[PDB]
Amino acid sequence: RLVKALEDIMVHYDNTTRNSLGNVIQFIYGEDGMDAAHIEKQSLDTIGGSDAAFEKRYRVDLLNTDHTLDPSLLESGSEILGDLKLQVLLDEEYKQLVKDRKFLREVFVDGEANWPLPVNIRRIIQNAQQTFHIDHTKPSDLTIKDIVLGVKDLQENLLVLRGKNEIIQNAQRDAVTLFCCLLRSRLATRRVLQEYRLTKQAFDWVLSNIEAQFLRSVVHPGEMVGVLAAQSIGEPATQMTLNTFHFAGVASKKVSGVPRLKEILNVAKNMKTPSLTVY
Amino acid sequence: LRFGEMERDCMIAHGAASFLKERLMEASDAFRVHICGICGLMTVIAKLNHNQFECKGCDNKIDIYQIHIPYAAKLLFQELMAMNITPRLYTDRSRDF
Amino acid sequence: VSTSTFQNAATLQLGQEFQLKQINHQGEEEELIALNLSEARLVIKEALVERRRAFKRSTREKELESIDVLLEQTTGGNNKDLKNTMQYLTNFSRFRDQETVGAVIQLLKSTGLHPFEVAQLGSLACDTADEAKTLIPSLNNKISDDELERILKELSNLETLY
Amino acid sequence: AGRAALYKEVYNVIASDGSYVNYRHMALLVDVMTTQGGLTSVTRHGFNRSNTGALMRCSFEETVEILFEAGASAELDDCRGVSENVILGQMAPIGTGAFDVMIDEESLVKYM
Amino acid sequence: KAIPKDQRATTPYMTKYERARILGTRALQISMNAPVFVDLEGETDPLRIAMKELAEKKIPLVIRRYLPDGSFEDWSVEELIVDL
Amino acid sequence: MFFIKDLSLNITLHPSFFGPRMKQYLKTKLLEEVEGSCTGKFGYILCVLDYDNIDIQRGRILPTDGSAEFNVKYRAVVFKPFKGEVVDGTVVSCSQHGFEVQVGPMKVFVTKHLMPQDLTFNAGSNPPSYQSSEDVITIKSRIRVKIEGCISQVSSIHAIGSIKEDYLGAI
Amino acid sequence: VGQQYSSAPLRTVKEVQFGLFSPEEVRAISVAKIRFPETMDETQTRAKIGGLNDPRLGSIDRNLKCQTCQEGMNECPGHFGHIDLAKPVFHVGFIAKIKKVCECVCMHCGKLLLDEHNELMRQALAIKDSKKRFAAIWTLCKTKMVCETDVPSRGCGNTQPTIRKDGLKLVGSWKELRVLSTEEILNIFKHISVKDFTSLGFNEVFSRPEWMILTCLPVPPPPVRPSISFQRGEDDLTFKLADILKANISLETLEHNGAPHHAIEEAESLLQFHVATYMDNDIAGQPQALQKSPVKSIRARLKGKEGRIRGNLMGKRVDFSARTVISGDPNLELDQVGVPKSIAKTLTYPEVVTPYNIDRLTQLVRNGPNEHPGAKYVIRDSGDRIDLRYSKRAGDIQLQYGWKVERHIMDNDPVLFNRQPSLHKMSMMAHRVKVIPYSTFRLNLSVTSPYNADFDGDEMNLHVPQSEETRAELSQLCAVPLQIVSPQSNKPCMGIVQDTLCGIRKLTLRDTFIELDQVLNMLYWVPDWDGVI
DNA sequence: ACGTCCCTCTCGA
RNA sequence: UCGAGAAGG
Numbered sequence A: 001r002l003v004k005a006l007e008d009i010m011v012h013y014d015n016t017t018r019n020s021l022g023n024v025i026q027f028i029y030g031e032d033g034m035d036a037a038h039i040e041k042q043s044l045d046t047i048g049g050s051d052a053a054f055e056k057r058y059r060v061d062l063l064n065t066d067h068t069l070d071p072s073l074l075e076s077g078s079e080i081l082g083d084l085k086l087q088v089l090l091d092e093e094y095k096q097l098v099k100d101r102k103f104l105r106e107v108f109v110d111g112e113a114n115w116p117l118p119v120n121i122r123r124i125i126q127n128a129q130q131t132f133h134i135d136h137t138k139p140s141d142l143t144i145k146d147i148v149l150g151v152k153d154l155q156e157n158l159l160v161l162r163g164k165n166e167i168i169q170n171a172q173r174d175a176v177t178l179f180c181c182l183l184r185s186r187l188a189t190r191r192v193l194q195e196y197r198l199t200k201q202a203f204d205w206v207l208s209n210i211e212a213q214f215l216r217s218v219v220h221p222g223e224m225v226g227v228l229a230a231q232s233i234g235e236p237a238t239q240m241t242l243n244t245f246h247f248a249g250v251a252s253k254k255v256s257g258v259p260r261l262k263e264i265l266n267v268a269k270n271m272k273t274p275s276l277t278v279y
Numbered sequence B: 001l002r003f004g005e006m007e008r009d010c011m012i013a014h015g016a017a018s019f020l021k022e023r024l025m026e027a028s029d030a031f032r033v034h035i036c037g038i039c040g041l042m043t044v045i046a047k048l049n050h051n052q053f054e055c056k057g058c059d060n061k062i063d064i065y066q067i068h069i070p071y072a073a074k075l076l077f078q079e080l081m082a083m084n085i086t087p088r089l090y091t092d093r094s095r096d097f
Numbered sequence C: 001v002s003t004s005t006f007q008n009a010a011t012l013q014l015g016q017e018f019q020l021k022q023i024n025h026q027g028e029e030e031e032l033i034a035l036n037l038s039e040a041r042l043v044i045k046e047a048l049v050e051r052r053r054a055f056k057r058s059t060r061e062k063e064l065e066s067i068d069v070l071l072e073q074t075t076g077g078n079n080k081d082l083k084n085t086m087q088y089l090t091n092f093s094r095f096r097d098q099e100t101v102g103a104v105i106q107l108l109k110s111t112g113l114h115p116f117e118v119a120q121l122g123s124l125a126c127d128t129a130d131e132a133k134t135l136i137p138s139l140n141n142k143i144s145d146d147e148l149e150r151i152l153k154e155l156s157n158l159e160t161l162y
Numbered sequence D: 001a002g003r004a005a006l007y008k009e010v011y012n013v014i015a016s017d018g019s020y021v022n023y024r025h026m027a028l029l030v031d032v033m034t035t036q037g038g039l040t041s042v043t044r045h046g047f048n049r050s051n052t053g054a055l056m057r058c059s060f061e062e063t064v065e066i067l068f069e070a071g072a073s074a075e076l077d078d079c080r081g082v083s084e085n086v087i088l089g090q091m092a093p094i095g096t097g098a099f100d101v102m103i104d105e106e107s108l109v110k111y112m
Numbered sequence E: 001k002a003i004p005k006d007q008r009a010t011t012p013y014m015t016k017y018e019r020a021r022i023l024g025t026r027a028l029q030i031s032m033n034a035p036v037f038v039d040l041e042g043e044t045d046p047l048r049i050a051m052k053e054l055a056e057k058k059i060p061l062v063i064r065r066y067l068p069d070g071s072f073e074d075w076s077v078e079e080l081i082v083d084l
Numbered sequence F: 001m002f003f004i005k006d007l008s009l010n011i012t013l014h015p016s017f018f019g020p021r022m023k024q025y026l027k028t029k030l031l032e033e034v035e036g037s038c039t040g041k042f043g044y045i046l047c048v049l050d051y052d053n054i055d056i057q058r059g060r061i062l063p064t065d066g067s068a069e070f071n072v073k074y075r076a077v078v079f080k081p082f083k084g085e086v087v088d089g090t091v092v093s094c095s096q097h098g099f100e101v102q103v104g105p106m107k108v109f110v111t112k113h114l115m116p117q118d119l120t121f122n123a124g125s126n127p128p129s130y131q132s133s134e135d136v137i138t139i140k141s142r143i144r145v146k147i148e149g150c151i152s153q154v155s156s157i158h159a160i161g162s163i164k165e166d167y168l169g170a171i
Numbered sequence G: 001v002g003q004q005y006s007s008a009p010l011r012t013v014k015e016v017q018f019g020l021f022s023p024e025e026v027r028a029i030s031v032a033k034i035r036f037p038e039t040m041d042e043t044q045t046r047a048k049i050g051g052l053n054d055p056r057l058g059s060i061d062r063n064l065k066c067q068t069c070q071e072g073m074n075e076c077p078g079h080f081g082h083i084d085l086a087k088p089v090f091h092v093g094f095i096a097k098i099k100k101v102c103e104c105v106c107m108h109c110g111k112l113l114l115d116e117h118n119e120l121m122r123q124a125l126a127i128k129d130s131k132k133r134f135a136a137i138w139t140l141c142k143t144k145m146v147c148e149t150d151v152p153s154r155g156c157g158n159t160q161p162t163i164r165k166d167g168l169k170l171v172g173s174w175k176e177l178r179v180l181s182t183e184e185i186l187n188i189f190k191h192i193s194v195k196d197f198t199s200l201g202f203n204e205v206f207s208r209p210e211w212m213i214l215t216c217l218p219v220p221p222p223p224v225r226p227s228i229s230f231q232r233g234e235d236d237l238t239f240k241l242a243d244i245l246k247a248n249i250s251l252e253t254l255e256h257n258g259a260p261h262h263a264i265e266e267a268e269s270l271l272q273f274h275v276a277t278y279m280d281n282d283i284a285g286q287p288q289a290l291q292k293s294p295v296k297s298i299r300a301r302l303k304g305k306e307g308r309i310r311g312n313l314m315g316k317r318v319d320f321s322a323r324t325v326i327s328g329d330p331n332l333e334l335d336q337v338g339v340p341k342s343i344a345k346t347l348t349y350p351e352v353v354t355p356y357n358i359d360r361l362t363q364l365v366r367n368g369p370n371e372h373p374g375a376k377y378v379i380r381d382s383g384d385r386i387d388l389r390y391s392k393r394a395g396d397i398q399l400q401y402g403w404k405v406e407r408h409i410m411d412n413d414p415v416l417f418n419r420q421p422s423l424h425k426m427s428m429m430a431h432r433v434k435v436i437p438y439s440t441f442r443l444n445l446s447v448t449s450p451y452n453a454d455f456d457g458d459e460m461n462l463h464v465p466q467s468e469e470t471r472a473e474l475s476q477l478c479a480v481p482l483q484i485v486s487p488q489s490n491k492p493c494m495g496i497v498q499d500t501l502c503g504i505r506k507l508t509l510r511d512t513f514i515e516l517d518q519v520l521n522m523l524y525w526v527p528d529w530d531g532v533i
Numbered sequence H: 001a002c003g004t005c006c007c008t009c010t011c012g013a
Numbered sequence I: 001u002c003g004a005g006a007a008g009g
């Protein structure tokens, strides 16, 4: 029943997900426009933790003596302490990082940080250190405005939908939001120098690799997500209901499941175990 | 061996369209029917080793087309016709949309 | 595969294809292309001279044989029709020269009569307007018998010294 | 709002055995049911009544029945569906059939 | 009959289905004594020859991507990006 | 008459042709089919006009077949007769029932009934001819005929004419 | 050779326009009138009969050409005939909608019961839909049992009955009960206004309501109702058509010579029934016609699960296919499958004779169909098949380009491999061929879980392409290495299992050590070993 | 009014 | 060549 109801649906050449009639089901497949194989459970370090540890890890204050970057973490360190025209960009960065933490706490209200997202950043900075042999005793050769500006310019090129009018541009802005919030979380200025110990070449190589692996992770117009989605729950249901352990009474309500799959699909107003969860 | 509905779906998910046609047309069925440009149904007399095409009823010797479809579909359309249903096969579109 | 396009009596009641308003090859309502025997003989000749020049990149009833050898070069001998056509055209053309033909077209195409009438009037030599309107039936009231004979006499002088 | 509760119920039965399925597949089926105005069932009456092609709808549950209303109400088939080309032995607009391949004569002389 | 080559929305990257059909089409064609534009390095298989044509980007093919409404965006093999 | 029509036609090429004189063999195969061809719609398609500026358009590659189809666009000189037009021609045949007339690529036949009453016939003539009071229709004379009716015979549209009405016959 | 060549231009179907047959169009396309309910029974001898089966329909015998298109069995599609019915007759699948139209039109004048003045009807006729408009009219018209004279004109204004069916025909009651005959409703439907029936839910040229009542029935050609040789034996649908003509040819002589009211009304409901069970033999009431047994109606021919659509068009039994018991192999590579020698010598792929393989193909052709690297047939450019297994010229046969060599499938060929559950697209992948002995499909150990296959008697399907395009299709899209990371769960679906998994734990311990002699053997067992100790 | 998927064999008019 | 039964993953 599933497969016969979804086969029509596929990703068309403008990233719309339509049937034979041309009726739109999804404006970007998976609400982000990404192929399912290229996605791995990543960690958003900006949502979880105390606000106190948040400053320790992301805040950089050039207008300070304790909360500034030590000139041992990078070359332009003493010539950068108190740089007013640069600390404005440090504030612009940390103002976006705080917007992220509140924005993520809106979507994932329970405090969950591990979610599937394309491009494994933790592996890229791992291979960067392993490739360029980064010395955690000598300082980095990056300016403050190399990192934050290179990250901002990287987001402009992480493309899902190409278009002209603001309709597409504003929906494209939405399609990347999460991955950008993780990108900002993993390429904060403090992180890049204090614990990543990156160099200029290594950090450019990381940006170039993030741009490429992302452009690969995008769906390919022609993917038969219709039958693919139907199959994706088909094989599990053929398993499932592997009977084990007893407990009746409520019987854990719809623990249905295999007849709820029946119940859910044909809807049917007569429910087998209705239950109001009043908070 | 049966290449059934279950197996059809996996090729669809794979996107192997050209193969799915081959596995369903060159590996079975396939037929060279002659259909009328007027009524899209298989009335044309195909006197081809004499070169003479015609469709009596809607008399025409000029608007005839060759189409490659499974013989099980030719059978199906002829079966629907014996039930008084006309499944007209047209070699062009009009809906657009 | 047979010929496609884009879209019966001499009483202006021509075919559905051969109606006055017909589509240009680019796509505009253009008038139909009717051409008399002289207007024809020349158009085929100039298109066959064009073809001889492209394959390179790699007086009196005696032009009959010079056109006959051109047809043996430009097109295959598998076309007895174009051979029979050019023989008929050069033997039945009223005007041999490009200038005289164009001048004929000037006189004919100002009256605003149907293209097929234009073609059939440059092909058939008539004297009396009663003779003209009878061989081409579609006229009758379209042109004054004096005005028609005014054209006929103008056209008779414009005839090539055959 | 009903859309989210629909996904919530189907996520609960799949994750009842750990399993896990990527959001996109379930949200596809959920949106498919949703994007109509209301809840459309996944049976012979719920989605098969759609204005799609006759030849792909008869291949589900109600076969000869639909083909009879097709001749009666004088339907016309778009053929843009999957199961239509299958019945017709035609290369479907699926994946490798979602485009057409041409040759540029300019390129043919460009590459000697 | 509608599209311009400067107003292009579809992704500049070649899809896996585009590559798979282009390769098969060229391989099928080479198998039918078609002229090979690439320099042949001693290959008996037309699929490898088609892959060599794709590597040197010497395939005269051009994709016509049909959008849902009926529009079509022409992309030559030459200009499509092959990452994948 | 004689007309110039904006026709079109679709040719299919085998993949072995895809390279050099591609544009040329398509032009060549277009002539090989449409030249001297006769259809019931347009009549004698005689000469393909302006060989140089001939459109080719792109060629769609077939599905499981490697061939490619091209919608070729062209302009041509056509000749479709009509019931009522008067045409002049040269006599060709001469039989007991009448005589044929070569009007261009097409043969029109006149019946002894479709000739006036003063027209007699002389079979014992060298060459056989149709005599009359003052005129004689020899085996190769030039005659003005009115086409009375046309019939489409495969690839040769034939006709039947008259010279009985006024202003027809002599030259 | 397959099928001959026809000059007709080839295209593809792009619109399938469903309509209804007009009994004039049936009479126009039909070859001859089917009048005798006999097959070859002229005198049961060599020929058929000019009445049914090949009275210009299509050949019945193998060594005989068609009476119309003299082309014979393969390539001859079969041509339709017809039976002129002695009296009009309802249709089975339309008997419901035929009733529903009378519940809307005037049974005297033919106009709509509620035209273009009543408010709710005009909200309904404005619905420019399809059967959704037909549903609104039928409900808002069935109630009114009269017409109108004007009301601020529209005709007449007679009374309408309460019409409900009785298995086969319709009856309506005025207030007096009266049976509504087929011929009666036929006249009512033909008088329905051109604007009325179109706005009802029909079509001016494709589906007129008067064509739901059959006046002339199309006789299908022999292909859909064949003849078996058990000195023959026809099909059930051939039997059913003889029954229809038998009920018809009676009703003709009844209504001509005789004139009994009960007898003519008798054999009419019989013909009404034989035309009914011919299409569907599973009706509401109805005895469900049996012939010396039930009978397979045309609806049962098209019914799901099998019946053309589900079993012959959405799924096909196919050539170039294999199936055998599967066994496991740790020394085989992941993306390849072990194919028995027997299967490779049976399955073939047709390679176009090209200057690349010509020397390799000539070697294979002259090898033979029983030697492993060989070929079974070679197909000339002349479109004829040369059986290398029997032909006299098989030993020499000089090859030419543009020919085809149906050569045995050999090592590292793309094939399709399939387990029978077939639920995920990971249950059907492409494998390299590695021709092996013994009668089992020997596949790799780790591509176990994606197929869900063990080796306790498991059996698996193998399919092999035939074109170079669909080889690329399998190798570039459906290959096993591509499928390693599944989209269904964003994680890989293949892994190290059983002995490889138990041993990799027993090996990766600090307690585990290996000495010089055995270390060297392990290193050489690695295919991509750098040669460095 | 639907009521999984393919396989191998053997019995009856 | 249609209907009934047994059996494998």
Ligand SMILES: [Zn+2]
Residues within 6 Å of the ligand: B036, B037, B038, B039, B040, B043, B055, B058
């Ligand atoms: Zn027709």
Ligand SMILES: [Zn+2]
Residues within 6 Å of the ligand: G057, G058, G059, G066, G067, G068, G069, G070, G071, G072, G076, G077, G078, G079
């Ligand atoms: Zn036949």
Ligand SMILES: [Zn+2]
Residues within 6 Å of the ligand: G106, G107, G108, G109, G110, G111, G147, G155, G156, G157, G158
């Ligand atoms: Zn009335």
